[model samples]
Target: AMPMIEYLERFSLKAKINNTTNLDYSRRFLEPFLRGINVVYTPPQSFQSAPRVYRVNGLSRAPASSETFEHDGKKVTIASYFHSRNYPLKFPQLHCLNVGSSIKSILLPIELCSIEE
Candidate 1:
């Protein structure tokens, strides 16, 4: 249906919950914070609809680049949008592995800015 990149746009959201305090408020507040309320909420949006699956980049070879697809859509990327919107109360965050055998090696310094969702 869509292009190749469209299918590869899986975003992994890393959100932490503090069980030491108000769990409900913690979660509810977290939702809007992640939705980018500062940005306009654009409906009819698109998000990757696949479970976390790993695939080699193929371009780099040697399993150097591997990625997993997720549902972290624009609603989740643009922080402002999240500020305006909200995520369901009970939606647990999804986690995936960042392991790979690339030339860069595993111990190299890396900056994670949402998996190109």
Candidate 2:
């Protein structure tokens, strides 16, 4: 016989995170709240129009405004990426929330996400 846990592959979920709901604090303050929880993001000018959920793996050592990557044609930071997309940033000095895997991971700013903690 199969157990209930095994029967349902998509059983895990988070508390709740509403859109346009975020803390206007520094990374230190926001990071702790997302230590072991999920985050929700569904803002304008985003890659996805629908709400996206991510089980935060950890935080970037560098601030959201400093983390650079090969975006578009040249190197760009997370803050720049979003700002260029017409999305405003509340706190670019704060760290980013790391998610997914090492090879195919993604970094999101705490300002654009709401914690389900």
Candidate 3:
């Protein structure tokens, strides 16, 4: 593991997707989801309760793009670490059950660094 400051500063950056495909049905259908984990922090003991710290999900609304990473052998769809989309089906979905005439600005985690809850 890296120091919090170093980890944050090192990975903080805007990334874009470059491609997508449905070539191999088996591989595409079996595409594995990233392992999700909640990050916990150890803070000063003086505080009675530790505040819930959150990471920014930068790719929350970013179209699933194929990007090559050092770990990924091929391409992978980069996603926002935080999965708080209003509507799973559509883009920028409304939070409320009622879909009104006026558009609501969904408060999505624009940048997700990590998740614990």
Q: Pick by TM-score: which candidate is best?
A: 2
Summarize candidate 3's per-residue lDDT along 23-92 as a digit string, tens digits. 1221222123211222333322342436334322112222322222222355322222122222122211
**Model 2: colliding residue pairs:** none
lDDT of 2: 0.58
For 56-111, candidate 2 gives per-residue lDDT tens digits of 76667677778886655687898878887888766565567776667755787755
Report how far residue 50 has shifted in candidate 1, in Å.
3.1
What's the CA error at residue 99 for candidate 2, in Å?
1.4
Could you tell me the TM-score of candidate 2? Answer: 0.63
lDDT of 1 by residue, 7-67 (tens): 2232222333322323334323333333321211122123223322222221211111122
Clashes of each: 15, 0, 9
Question: Would you list the C-alpha lDDT of every candidate in the order shown?
Answer: 0.24, 0.58, 0.25
Q: Native-vs-model 1 lDDT?
A: 0.24
Off by over 4 Å in 3: 14-35, 48-117
Give the residue spans of candidate 1 off by over 4 A. Answer: 1-21, 37-49, 52-117
Clashes of 2: 0
Clashing pairs in 3: 38-115, 38-116, 56-111, 56-112, 56-113, 57-111, 57-112, 58-111, 58-112
